[PDB]
Design a protein around this ligand. Structure first.
Ligand code: UHI
Length: 127
C-alpha cells in the first residue's frame, strides 16, 4: 500500500563521467520523450497511494521513471550510456509487466519506446 523510497539519484561515492553519449541521452533522448504528449504518467515515480494501486510495489521491484532518469542525467550520476539506457528499458518493462495489454498506459509506453528506439539507434560513437 505505501510508497517505497524513490530510486537514488545521488551517491557521492559512485564514480561518474560526462561523455558525449551521456550528453546525447540527456539532450536528445530524455528531452524528446519528456516533451511528448504521453510523457506525463512517466515523469515521476509511480505514486501508488494517489493512484490507488496498492499492489504496484508488490509486483514492481525495480521501479524507474523519467523524473529519476532526468535527475540522474542532470546530476551526472552515470558512468556510461548503457546504465541510462537500462533505466529507460526498466521503465518500459515495468509498465508492460504491471498493466494489461491494450491499456492506455501501455499504448503510451509503446509510443515513447518507439521514439526511444529510434534515438538509441543513432547513439553517437564514443569520443
Ligand atoms: C508507469 N505508470 C504510470 C501511471 C500514472 C502515474 C501517475 S503519478 C503522477 O501518480 O505517479 C499519474 C498517471 C498515471 O497514468 C496515467 C495514464 C494511464 C492514463 C499508472 C497509472 C495506473 C496504472 C498503471 C500506471 C503505470 O504503470
Amino acid at each position: 500500500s505505501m510508497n517505497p523510497p524513490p530510486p537514488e539519484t545521488s551517491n557521492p561515492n559512485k564514480p561518474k563521467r560526462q561523455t558525449n553519449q551521456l550528453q546525447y541521452l540527456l539532450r536528445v533522448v530524455l528531452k524528446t520523450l519528456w516533451k511528448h504528449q504521453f510523457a506525463w504518467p512517466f515523469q515521476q515515480p509511480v505514486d501508488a497511494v494517489k493512484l490507488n494501486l496498492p499492489d504496484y510495489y508488490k509486483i514492481i521491484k525495480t521501479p524507474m521513471d523519467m523524473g529519476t532518469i532526468k535527475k540522474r542525467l542532470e546530476n551526472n550520476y552515470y558512468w556510461n550510456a548503457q546504465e541510462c539506457i537500462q533505466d529507460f528499458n526498466t521503465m518500459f518493462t515495468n509498465c508492460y509487466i504491471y498493466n494489461k495489454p491494450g491499456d492506455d498506459i501501455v499504448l503510451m509506453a509503446e509510443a515513447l519506446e518507439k521514439l526511444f528506439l529510434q534515438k538509441i539507434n543513432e547513439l553517437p560513437t564514443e569520443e
